[PDB]
Design an enzyme around this catalytic site. Structure first.
Site, PDB file in Angstrom:
ATOM      1  N   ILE A 273       0.850  -1.188   0.000  1.00  0.00           N
ATOM      2  CA  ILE A 273       0.000   0.000   0.000  1.00  0.00           C
ATOM      3  C   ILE A 273       0.893   1.248   0.000  1.00  0.00           C
ATOM      4  O   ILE A 273       0.726   2.132  -0.835  1.00  0.00           O
ATOM      5  CB  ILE A 273      -0.997  -0.028   1.196  1.00  0.00           C
ATOM      6  CG1 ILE A 273      -2.027  -1.164   1.049  1.00  0.00           C
ATOM      7  CG2 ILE A 273      -1.690   1.327   1.383  1.00  0.00           C
ATOM      8  CD1 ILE A 273      -2.818  -1.476   2.351  1.00  0.00           C
TER       9      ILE A 273
ATOM     10  N   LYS B  41       1.005  -3.037   8.874  1.00  0.00           N
ATOM     11  CA  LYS B  41       2.056  -2.040   8.857  1.00  0.00           C
ATOM     12  C   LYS B  41       3.264  -2.654   9.535  1.00  0.00           C
ATOM     13  O   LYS B  41       3.173  -3.095  10.679  1.00  0.00           O
ATOM     14  CB  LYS B  41       1.614  -0.750   9.566  1.00  0.00           C
ATOM     15  CG  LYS B  41       2.620   0.385   9.507  1.00  0.00           C
ATOM     16  CD  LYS B  41       2.369   1.280  10.685  1.00  0.00           C
ATOM     17  CE  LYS B  41       2.857   2.663  10.481  1.00  0.00           C
ATOM     18  NZ  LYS B  41       2.197   3.587  11.422  1.00  0.00           N
TER      19      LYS B  41
ATOM     20  N   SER C 272       9.114   2.314   7.668  1.00  0.00           N
ATOM     21  CA  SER C 272       7.786   1.701   7.669  1.00  0.00           C
ATOM     22  C   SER C 272       7.384   1.171   6.281  1.00  0.00           C
ATOM     23  O   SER C 272       7.936   1.617   5.275  1.00  0.00           O
ATOM     24  CB  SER C 272       6.752   2.702   8.179  1.00  0.00           C
TER      25      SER C 272
ATOM     26  N   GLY D 163       6.697   4.264   4.607  1.00  0.00           N
ATOM     27  CA  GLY D 163       7.220   5.379   5.393  1.00  0.00           C
ATOM     28  C   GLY D 163       8.735   5.347   5.453  1.00  0.00           C
ATOM     29  O   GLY D 163       9.376   4.730   4.591  1.00  0.00           O
ATOM     30  N   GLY D 164       9.310   6.007   6.462  1.00  0.00           N
ATOM     31  CA  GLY D 164      10.760   6.065   6.651  1.00  0.00           C
ATOM     32  C   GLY D 164      11.379   4.682   6.696  1.00  0.00           C
ATOM     33  O   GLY D 164      12.032   4.243   5.741  1.00  0.00           O
TER      34      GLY D 164
ATOM     35  N   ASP E 235      -1.804  18.668  12.887  1.00  0.00           N
ATOM     36  CA  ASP E 235      -1.371  18.614  11.497  1.00  0.00           C
ATOM     37  C   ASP E 235      -2.324  17.780  10.659  1.00  0.00           C
ATOM     38  O   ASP E 235      -1.997  16.654  10.294  1.00  0.00           O
ATOM     39  CB  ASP E 235       0.046  18.050  11.395  1.00  0.00           C
ATOM     40  CG  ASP E 235       0.480  17.826   9.962  1.00  0.00           C
ATOM     41  OD1 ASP E 235       0.820  18.814   9.281  1.00  0.00           O
ATOM     42  OD2 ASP E 235       0.481  16.661   9.517  1.00  0.00           O
TER      43      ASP E 235
ATOM     44  N   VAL F  36       3.438  -0.402   4.633  1.00  0.00           N
ATOM     45  CA  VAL F  36       2.045  -0.823   4.814  1.00  0.00           C
ATOM     46  C   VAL F  36       1.747  -1.779   3.657  1.00  0.00           C
ATOM     47  O   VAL F  36       2.033  -1.440   2.511  1.00  0.00           O
ATOM     48  CB  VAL F  36       1.058   0.378   4.868  1.00  0.00           C
ATOM     49  CG1 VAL F  36      -0.391  -0.088   5.027  1.00  0.00           C
ATOM     50  CG2 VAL F  36       1.428   1.354   5.981  1.00  0.00           C
TER      51      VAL F  36
HETATM   52  C1  7RO Z   1      -1.608   4.458  -2.718  1.00  0.00           C
HETATM   53  N1  7RO Z   1      -2.957   4.636  -2.157  1.00  0.00           N
HETATM   54  C2  7RO Z   1      -3.356   6.041  -1.973  1.00  0.00           C
HETATM   55  C3  7RO Z   1      -3.924   3.648  -2.304  1.00  0.00           C
HETATM   56  O1  7RO Z   1      -4.354   3.343  -3.405  1.00  0.00           O
HETATM   57  C4  7RO Z   1      -4.395   3.002  -1.061  1.00  0.00           C
HETATM   58  C5  7RO Z   1      -4.455   3.732   0.121  1.00  0.00           C
HETATM   59  C6  7RO Z   1      -4.923   3.150   1.283  1.00  0.00           C
HETATM   60  C7  7RO Z   1      -5.341   1.816   1.271  1.00  0.00           C
HETATM   61  N2  7RO Z   1      -5.879   1.149   2.372  1.00  0.00           N
HETATM   62  C8  7RO Z   1      -5.423   1.123   3.694  1.00  0.00           C
HETATM   63  C9  7RO Z   1      -4.353   1.952   4.075  1.00  0.00           C
HETATM   64  C10 7RO Z   1      -3.988   1.867   5.416  1.00  0.00           C
HETATM   65  C11 7RO Z   1      -4.658   1.000   6.313  1.00  0.00           C
HETATM   66  C12 7RO Z   1      -5.692   0.228   5.821  1.00  0.00           C
HETATM   67  N3  7RO Z   1      -6.083   0.273   4.550  1.00  0.00           N
HETATM   68  C13 7RO Z   1      -4.074   1.146   7.600  1.00  0.00           C
HETATM   69  C14 7RO Z   1      -3.081   2.073   7.510  1.00  0.00           C
HETATM   70  C15 7RO Z   1      -2.261   2.545   8.571  1.00  0.00           C
HETATM   71  C16 7RO Z   1      -0.867   2.835   8.571  1.00  0.00           C
HETATM   72  N4  7RO Z   1      -0.478   3.255   9.795  1.00  0.00           N
HETATM   73  N5  7RO Z   1      -1.598   3.230  10.563  1.00  0.00           N
HETATM   74  C17 7RO Z   1      -1.574   3.620  11.973  1.00  0.00           C
HETATM   75  C18 7RO Z   1      -2.704   2.806   9.860  1.00  0.00           C
HETATM   76  N6  7RO Z   1      -3.000   2.541   6.159  1.00  0.00           N
HETATM   77  C19 7RO Z   1      -2.117   3.507   5.599  1.00  0.00           C
HETATM   78  O2  7RO Z   1      -1.313   4.129   6.243  1.00  0.00           O
HETATM   79  O3  7RO Z   1      -2.273   3.669   4.260  1.00  0.00           O
HETATM   80  C20 7RO Z   1      -1.438   4.676   3.599  1.00  0.00           C
HETATM   81  C21 7RO Z   1      -0.009   4.194   3.687  1.00  0.00           C
HETATM   82  C22 7RO Z   1      -1.906   4.751   2.166  1.00  0.00           C
HETATM   83  C23 7RO Z   1      -1.616   6.000   4.305  1.00  0.00           C
HETATM   84  C24 7RO Z   1      -5.253   1.114   0.070  1.00  0.00           C
HETATM   85 CL1  7RO Z   1      -5.733  -0.532   0.002  1.00  0.00          CL
HETATM   86  C25 7RO Z   1      -4.789   1.683  -1.094  1.00  0.00           C
END
Ligand code: 7RO
Length: 252
Positions: free
Chosen positions: A17, A39, A23, A20-21, A133, A25
């Site tokens: 997905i 994550k 990190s 991060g630094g 933020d 996902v």
């Molecule tokens: C590249 N992007 C924008 C996408 O197409 C995209 C963005 C988000 C998606 N889902 C998604 C993202 C998710 C999570 C659960 N589902 C959980 C998290 C998460 C990370 N840290 N914490 C505390 C929660 N998460 C997350 O951080 O997603 C991003 C990295 C895109 C911000 C999915 Cl499946 C695809």
């Protein structure tokens, strides 16, 4: 196609997905073939001040699970001196990406999303946490419901409150930020998205003689909310409990 273990349970990586630094996902499948988000965090080069921020945001994500459904579900986790694995619910896309993709924004969609952001930011406030933020990337769409990913405990300047620039602060800071998100969802731009120069932009948010344009819209309640949120003096700016009792949120 790599398979990982979080507290004995096996997860099959579908795609990455984000990253991060230290990190990463991932989108995963469990043994019951259910879809989750894992994550992975690397603590190899992470300092003691970094570890506490991570521990604190996990505990906050853990405690706020119970109080609200507008905070991302944390199913399981595994923490060692070497890494972190957090097993969370899987969203479709983040609000920042989704707003960038959708040209037209439905008033119902907007209202429903606004309601969600207020509930999430209200919950963190209740527990004494101010994000400080807020940007649309902090929100995630999970079954047509906006959910809060982080708490600003563990990057664009457009959503910054004048008080964050004057510290060169309070729950009213988050109100300003949410105000800019709704402003983007209303007008298709941030109040100061016109200003390409970052220092000229920062000079504008801090300046009261720089009037923010609130064009006449078929939604008068939406105008009042935006006008109420985007007041430079945080004492003069509307609170979240009042925003929740506003006609915009409450009337059919
Ligand atoms: C590249 N992007 C924008 C996408 O197409 C995209 C963005 C988000 C998606 N889902 C998604 C993202 C998710 C999570 C659960 N589902 C959980 C998290 C998460 C990370 N840290 N914490 C505390 C929660 N998460 C997350 O951080 O997603 C991003 C990295 C895109 C911000 C999915 Cl499946 C695809």
């Amino acid at each position: 196609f790599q398979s990982m273990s979080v507290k004995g349970r096996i997860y099959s990586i579908l795609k990455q997905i984000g990253s991060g630094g230290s990190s990463k996902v991932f989108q995963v499948l469990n043994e019951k073939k259910q879809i989750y988000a894992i994550k992975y965090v690397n603590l190899e080069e992470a300092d003691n001040q970094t570890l506490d921020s991570y521990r604190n945001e996990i505990a906050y994500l853990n405690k706020l699970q119970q109080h609200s459904d507008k905070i991302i579900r944390l199913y399981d986790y595994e923490i060692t001196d070497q890494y972190i694995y957090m097993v969370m619910e899987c969203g479709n896309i983040d609000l920042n990406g989704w707003l960038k993709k959708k040209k037209s924004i439905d008033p119902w969609e907007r209202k429903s999303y606004w309601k969600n952001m207020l509930e999430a930011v209200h919950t963190i406030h209740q527990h004494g946490i101010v994000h400080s933020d807020l940007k649309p990337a902090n929100f995630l769409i999970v079954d047509g419901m906006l959910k809060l990913i982080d708490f600003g405990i563990a990057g664009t300047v457009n959503y910054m409150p004048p008080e964050a620039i004057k510290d060169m602060i309070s729950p009213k800071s988050d109100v300003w930020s949410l105000g800019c998100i709704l402003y983007y969802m209303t007008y298709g731009k941030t109040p100061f998205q016109q200003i390409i120069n970052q220092i000229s932009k920062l000079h504008a948010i801090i300046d009261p003689n720089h009037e923010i344009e609130f064009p006449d819209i078929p939604e008068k309640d939406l105008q009042d909310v935006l006008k109420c949120c985007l007041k430079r003096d945080p004492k003069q700016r509307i609170s979240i409990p009042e925003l929740l009792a506003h006609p915009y949120v409450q009337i059919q």
